[PDB]
Every structure is written in structure tokens, then in C-alpha cells.
Amino acid sequence: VNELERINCIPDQPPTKATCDQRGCCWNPQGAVSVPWCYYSKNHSYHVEGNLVNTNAGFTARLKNLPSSPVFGSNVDNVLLTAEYQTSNRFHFKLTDQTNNRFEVPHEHVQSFSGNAAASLTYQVEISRQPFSIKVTRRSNNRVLFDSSIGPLLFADQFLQLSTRLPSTNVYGLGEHVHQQYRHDMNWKTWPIFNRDTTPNGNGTNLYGAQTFFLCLEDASGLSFGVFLMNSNAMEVVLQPAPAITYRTIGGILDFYVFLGNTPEQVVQEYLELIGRPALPSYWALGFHLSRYEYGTLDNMREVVERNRAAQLPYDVQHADIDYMDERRDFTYDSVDFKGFPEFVNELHNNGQKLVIIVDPAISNNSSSSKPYGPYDRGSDMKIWVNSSDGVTPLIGEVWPGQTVFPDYTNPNCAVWWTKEFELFHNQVEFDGIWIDMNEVSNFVDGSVSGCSTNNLNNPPFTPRILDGYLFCKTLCMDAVQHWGKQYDIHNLYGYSMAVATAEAAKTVFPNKRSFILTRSTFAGSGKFAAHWLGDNTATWDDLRWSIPGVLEFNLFGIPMVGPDICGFALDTPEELCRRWMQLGAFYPFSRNHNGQGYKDQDPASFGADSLLLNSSRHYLNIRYTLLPYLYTLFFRAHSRGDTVARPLLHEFYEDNSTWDVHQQFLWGPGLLITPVLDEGAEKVMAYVPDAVWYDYETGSQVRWRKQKVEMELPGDKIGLHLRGGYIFPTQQPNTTTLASRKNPLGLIIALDENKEAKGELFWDDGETKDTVANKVYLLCEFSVTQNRLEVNISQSTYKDPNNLAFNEIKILGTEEPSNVTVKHNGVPSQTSPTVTYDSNLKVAIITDIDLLLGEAYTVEWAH
């Protein structure tokens, strides 16, 4: 009835009463824009047949199809509901064809459940039988979280749909898209999901990855929940103002998880506990990365490397794009334009830097007796290509080198082939990390060099609103064949399988190291293997603004090392845009300036040795590097516990509804507030100051604002950076590389809260060994301040850095003058009495001539 609650029965064409009648739906052409004229009745779909059956894990139910017209075809007579109370905070239910096995995602991390129902549930499940619906409610307040009763269950071979009411309009997630805002537009929006090489622009299309997870903040108490659909077929998600969300997919099964938490962070941690927590990055990967498509020659690349080094830019990583290769073919380098490549790699390494190489999936099939191409010959020997529908002939498409075949990374034999290719190539060019691109998989022809046969896979009864309207557009035929199944079912898993296989190759090429993998295409869980960048953006102010929601969303998806191409991939970048983008970009979890072919240089040093852009870039990159121990400890918590790294204001300040749609500012973890200027010509920014004590990072002075909108003054050389009272931030004196910075003196910034208290922590390991956390080879220490006292305590202590690191400076914000400062080491008074400098105007104390060894317990005490 209520028009906001109508579930659209004609998603496929403009609505007509004739089609409405044919489908047995309800007709009412009255309503506002976007309200469906034709909608499902209150008894379309399925009913429960007989009784539910208790099982050890939860229960099952048989659903029987309520007689109806077959809109998009073969509609399943008998559906089985299997429900599992997997944990106190996670519910799993799956709807399958009772009579036939159907494709299920072969996820690498998620395991089948074998236990008994969890005790102490935070939720209750309710089942209605006529018609079928399922509801998940929060036990403590009976808030209805998931409720499918707004709409039917639809379950045909190539058309599956289920809807849920939502308890609020605070909805975040879904991908990969450019949403433009972070809090969802619930006003009749459809988001298609199907991995596609397309521009992240203002048109709201399907982009490179597939992420079905969303989080909902139920109210200001912080209680939140999330939902994940384990399905890799083309789909779309429909948001409406009831509020409700509908999932509509074209194959597979409806395999759902519902997660509850007391805060938005706890929901993310529950999601990541299920699909896999992100890999811990190499510490060097947290530094600044520089890149462009078509330096053209090694000489031109060297020029760029050298002018940025000459400028003393913090600068850890150089990427090499397809111009390094011999005619854009993997596992080669151009012996003329890139003559001396191995010597250049030595220079990079000698200067404490890292090389990341681009590698594409598609392999040139141009190889002869006369002119052999090794990777193709060896791949063909092992028979690891994606085949055409005939099941035996490798599919031919077209990418950078010309005609190509495509590896089937779902075949574990393919990982063996891939690893060997990397071993051979690493012997020639000693790269340190790998950038996997075009892995949607991207094809320059639609389907294959012979197009695609018309059939129900290439041309399904219902096509979600993907870019160009055909599944095989700029990708492979839907009836192509791989180890895990047909492309129709596993298309969205290509980039995921490739990331898995590339991590496997790293085990051999980089024994016991993390290395670094940057991936374009992703599926749920890709973060366990890889970082992500947000794709081929454009040098516009809109693109700068749109990057923040994309970063925040990928942190929800457990891919916290994420960022756009700073300054913009496509087009020449205006100096002002690039300056603002470098200021902000210094605080993306993944910080990379990358540029498209032919455009004017946009590396920082290219703007002039004395320029405002270079000076500002260097300044804020130096702050980023100073705070790297804090950022690294955030990545430790994402890896070990599932926390976000780049974090929405509302995850910390959910009590305050002014934060619920803030997406022009974000946090690093709980304590650092980042406020960019995001408008052309502006020297200020309208910003929200949450309900906490804040201190300006640069001056240390407490801001006079709290829980209110403000116009923050930020001239051309500034970005807003504020530290939260109650938090202690570990720092380390910066250098132009992390190789070197990791050997420098440490520091602490203690930002006092109103009670003159604060707490913080520091994770420290070797920065590069894989699984130091799982194998327990690390240091974790805690800092806590009360009146008159700092305690440094050690909770895990199985790694001691051989560089004799020590805290040599402590800066205290929001303090009255400390006097008689005293340092004790395990109770014993130690090392003279430190030097204390005090600014009574700003209420800042700095303690120096101190040496608190990393890994040792101390008490530091003072009077007022």
C-alpha cells in the first residue's frame, strides 16, 4: 500500500498495465517520481510447507512456490531455507533449490559451518509461513533489523530477488561505485554490480569490483548491523525510502549473512571475521608511491626519480607501467627504451626505494619457432587458459599487446605457471611488489575476437542496468569456461582469483615476506591479499571530492590500503587542484600520484624546485611519515581485529547526528581528524568539529570549537589536521624513505582530554615478515596518562628491534606547566631529570633529553 513500500514488479521496461496484468502485479499509476506504477501484491512468492526442522546449527524450512506467472523464466518449485546461528553476533541463512545443486561462490576464506547454534545470541530470528518471510531482530530492544516481508522471494534460474526493510536511513557501503556521498541516497536508486573496466565518473555505473556489504547505524546509541550477500553473478541493489533495500541477481543462490554490533566498528569487525581480515602491509608500502603511464623511456623515468629525490620528497616507491615492457607484453622489458633497467633497479634499491611493476593478466598469443614468447608457450604447455564454450579451445580476445589468451587463475595449476613466470622475470628485473591491472577481466573486444553466441548466458532474460547493457561488453563471453565454472557465474571472481594466485607466487619470489600487491578488480575478501586503487579518475575538483567516500567504503570492505590517483589520472592537472590533492593525498591510506599517457607531468618536483606545491607536498608528506608508527599500528588493528584505518567521523561520534552524513572529512583511526579544502579557489572550509577536545597538529593549540560546524581557515599551503583529546600518538622522526626512517628516534604526542588523561598504543615488528602477528613475533606497548603520570607498559614482547630505538621527546597538549619531571625504569629512578620546555600561552609542554627504550616499561611523573 504505502507508496514508499512498493516493490517494483517491472524493473525491466517502462510500466504498462498490460504487462502488470500479465505478471499478476498491482497497478497504480498514482505516485511521485520514481514510485513504481506496477508492484508486487501481498501474496506473490513462496509459502512454508509444513513444519520447520531443528538442526544442530539452527533450522531448515521447505518453501513451496505460490502459483504465479514466470516473468523471467524457470521459477523454482521447491526452495530450501537453511539457517545457522553461527555466532552470538552473526546469523547465516541460505535459500537453495531443494531438487538441484546450483552455483555457490567457492570463497577461499569462508568455511562451511559444522558447529552447534551459538549461545547468548544478540539476535532473534522469526519466520512467517504465509507468505514466506524472514525477520532478524535485535534481542535487547526488539529492533527489527532484517525483514523480508516488504516484498516477495523470487527464485528463478536466472532471476533471484529478496528485499529487506531497514531501521534507519543511515546506510553505508556497496561497490564498486562512485556514490558521490557516503551516506546512501535512499530516494529510489539502483546500483548495478558487475566487474567492469569503466571510468569512475558521475554516471553511477558498475566499476571494477563487486562488494555486496552494507552497514546500517540504527540510532545514536551506536547499535548497528550489516548484511552481506555471498553471490558473484551480475546483480543490482535497489534502495528506496521505506527505507528498504532489494538485492536482484541473475544466478547462483541467495546466501546471506547478518552481523550485529554495539558500534559501527564492531559491525565491520564481525564482517571481516567472516570474509577475512586484511593483510598487514609491508611498512614501506605506507610510504609515498610515484607513477605514470608512459614515461616512454628509462631515461625519462630516471629524470623524474632524480628530481623528486633532489627535492628531498618523502618517496619510497616507484611504479613502472606497461611502457617498461617489450611491446606491452608481460615478463619482458624493452631492451632499447629500457636498456639498463637492471642497473636502475640497483640504484633504486641503493637509495632505499622499492620498485613495483605492473603485470596484466592477458598473454599475447603471438609466438613462433623463429620468435618464441616464453609465457605463452609455457602457459599453453600447461593448458591453463580460459577456454571458449566448447570447453577445449583457449578463448582469444585483445588487450595491450594485440590478440591475447587469458589465464584461468581458478586452476591451481595456473598458480604454478604464474609463479614460474615471476621467478624467471625476477631474475632479470628485481622488482619488490606487483601491480595487477585490467583484471575485471578487461577485453578490448566484446566477448572474444568472434563476438559471443546468442544464448541465455550471453543474453539473459533479465540484464541488470550495467554499463552498455550487455554482460560481455569489454570482457569475456559469458559461456567461456574455467576451473571454478562458466564466466556467467565467476566473472566477478577473476580479479579475486588473480590476487590469490599472485600472493601464492610471492611465497616463492619473496620467501617469508609480505611484498606488496595492488589490484584493480576485487570481490569480498580481496583485502586478505591486496591493496586497491580507485581506478582511472580525472583531474577535476569533483573527482577530488568523490575520492573520500570511495576510500571510506573500501575500509568497510576490509581493503584499508586504498586511494585514488592523486592529482588525477586523465587530463593535465591544474596547479591548484594538484596542490590540494597532494595535501589530502598525504593522508590516504594508499598514497600514490599516478598520471595517464601524454598529459603534462604531475610529479611534485615537476612544479618547480621552489614551488608552493612542492613545499606543501613535502611538508605534509613529512607529517605523514612522522605519524607512520601510528598509521602502522592502525593497520595492525585492521589485520588482527578488523578495525577500519581511514574511518568515518560517525564511527567515533555516532552519538551526534551531525556526523551521520559527513564525507568531506575523515579520521585516521580514533584520534586524527583530517579536513581538506575541496573547492576551487577556496582558502577556507566549512567543517564539522565533533564533541571532543581538539588540538591543532601543527601549533598544538586547543581549538575553541566543539560539537559544531565551523568555517576553518586553510590558506593555499594548509590542510586541517587535529588531534583528539584523550589519545596518545606514537611518532618517529621522518626521513625520505621508511628504510631510513625506521632507524630514527621515536616520540609521543599526548593530547589530554578534559580530565587530563589520555591512552594510546604502539605495535612494532620487523616491518616486512609475513605473519609476524599469527606467529607472535612483535612488540605491543600501551601508554596511559593520568594526572601527574605517564605509564609505558608492555603487553607482548617477542620482537626487539636491533636499532636500539627509544622515545626521545614527549609533547603534551592541553597541560598546565609540568615541573620536577622524573623518569623511572621498572621503579628505579633513571637518567638525570629530563629537559622541559613550556609554552604557557598554548598550554604545550615538550620533554626532551629523555631516552625511553622501546620495549621497556617506564613511569614518567611530574608536579604542577
Ligand X SMILES: *[C@@H]1O[C@H](CO)[C@@H](O[C@@H]2O[C@H](CO)[C@@H](O)[C@H](O)[C@H]2NC(C)=O)[C@H](O)[C@H]1NC(C)=O
Ligand Y SMILES: OC[C@@H]1[C@@H](O)[C@H](O)C[S@@+]1C[C@@H](O)[C@@H](O)[C@H](O)[C@H](O)[C@@H](O)CO
Ligand Z SMILES: *[C@@H]1O[C@H](CO)[C@@H](O)[C@H](O)[C@H]1NC(C)=O
Distance (Å, rounded) from C-alpha 630 to C-alpha 588? 14
765 in contact with ligand Y (CB under 6 A): no
The answer to whether 481 contacts ligand X (rule: CB under 6 A) is: yes
Contacts of 32 (CB under 8 A, 6+ apart): 3
Nearest to 529 by CA among 553, 506, 499, 505: 499
Q: Which is nearer to ligand X, 68 or 443 (CB)?
A: 443
Q: Which of 18, 33, 392, 828 binds ligand X (CB under 6 A)?
A: 392
Does the annotation mark 440 as catalytic? yes
Euclidean distance between the first and the last CA atom of the chain, given in angstroms as a whole number: 68
Q: Are 20 and 38 in contact (CB under 8 A)?
A: yes
Nearer to ligand Y, 218 or 437 (CB): 437
Q: Alpha-carbon distance 151 to 43, whole Å?
A: 9
Identify whether the C-beta of residue 92 lies closer than 8 Å to the C-beta of residue 256.
Answer: yes
- What gap in Å lies between CA 138 and CA 744, rounded to an integer? 50
User: Can residue 536 be called a binding residue for ligand Y (CB under 6 A)?
Assistant: yes
CB of 737 to ligand Z, least distance (A): 6
Q: Which is nearer to ligand Y, 401 or 726 (CB)?
A: 401
Q: Which residues pair with 48 in a beta bridge?
A: 63
Q: The C-alpha cell of 391 is what?
A: 570447453
* CB 533, min distance to ligand Y, A: 8
CB 356 within 8 A of CB 320: yes
The one catalytic residue among 108, 432, 440, 603: 440
**Alpha helices of 410-467 — where are they, by DSSP H?**
412-428
Q: What's the min distance (Å) between Cβ of 381 and ligand X? A: 10
C-alpha to C-alpha distances, 193 to 175, 190, 639, nearest whole angstrom: 7, 10, 27
- The residues in 302-361 that bind ligand Y, with binding defined as CB under 6 A, are 321-322, 358
Q: What cell does 576 get?
A: 591548484
Identity of the residue, 426 or 483, whose beta carbon is nearer to ligand X in the bound complex: 483
391 vs 802 by CB, closer to ligand X: 391
Which CB atom, from 227 or from 467, has the smaller least distance to ligand Z? 467
Give the interface segment with ligand Z, choosing from 302-310, 556-564, 656-664, 733-741 (CB under 6 A): 733-741
Size of residue set near ligand Y by CB under 6 A: 10
Query: Which span (440-448, 479-487, 525-533, 574-582) binds ligand X, by CB under 6 A?
Result: 479-487
Q: Is 536 annotated as a binding residue?
A: yes
Per-residue cell: 600: 603534462
User: Judged by CB under 6 A, does residue 198 bind ligand Y?
Assistant: yes
Indicate which of ligand Z, ligand Y, ligand X, none lies near residue 828 (CB less than 5 to 8 Å, by partner kind). none
Q: Which of 187, 312, 387, 744 binds ligand Z (CB under 6 A)?
A: 744
* Residues from 436 through 465 that contact ligand Z (CB under 6 A): 465
Closest approach of ligand Z to the CB of residue 745, in Å: 8
Q: Is 757 a catalytic residue?
A: no
Report if residue 479 touches ligand X, rule: CB under 6 A: no
Using CB under 6 A as the binding rule, whether residue 231 contacts ligand Z is answered as: no
Give the single-character DSSP code of 260.
E
DSSP state of 432: S
User: Exposed, middle or buried: residue 204 (CB in 10 Å: 0-12, 13-18, 19+)?
Assistant: middle
Sign of the torsion angle spanned by Cα atoms 86, 91, 97, 102: negative
DSSP 818: P
Which DSSP state fits 299?
H
The conformational region for residue 459 under phi > 0 = left, psi -120 to 50 = alpha, else beta, is beta
Residue 408 within binding range of ligand X, rule CB under 6 A: yes
203 binds, among ligand Z, ligand X, ligand Y, none (CB under 5 to 8 A by kind): ligand Z
- 1 vs 40: CA distance, rounded Å: 10
* Nearest by Cα to 260 from 401, 140, 421, 116: 140
Site string for ligand Z, 199-218 (x = CB under 6 A): ----x-x-------------
CA 709/CA 690 separation, integer angstroms: 9
Q: Which stretch binds ligand Z (CB under 6 A): 46-54, 156-164, 732-740, 751-759?
A: 732-740
User: Could you say which of 59, 182, 293, 599 contacts ligand Y (CB under 6 A)?
Assistant: 293
437, 553, 652, 809: the catalytic one is 437
Residue with cell 591543532: 696
Closer to ligand Y by Cβ: residue 309 or 328: 328
- Give the sheet arrangement for strand 244-249, strand by strand: 154-156, 159-165, 244-249, 235-240, 189-193
Which of ligand X, ligand Y, ligand Z, none does residue 491 bind to, with CB < 5 to 8 Å depending on kind?
Answer: none
Place of cell 507468505: 131
Residue of 168, 366, 735, 830 that binds ligand Z (CB under 6 A): 735
- Give the footprint of ligand Y on this chain (CB under 6 A): 197-198, 293, 321-322, 358, 437, 442, 474, 536
- Residues in contact with ligand X by CB under 6 A are 383, 387, 391-392, 408, 481-483
Report the interface residues with ligand Z, using CB under 6 A: 203, 205, 352, 465, 467, 733, 735, 740, 744
What is the set of active-site residues?
437, 440
Annotated binding-site residues read 197, 321, 520, 536, 594
Report the binding-site residues for acarbose.
197, 321, 520, 536, 594
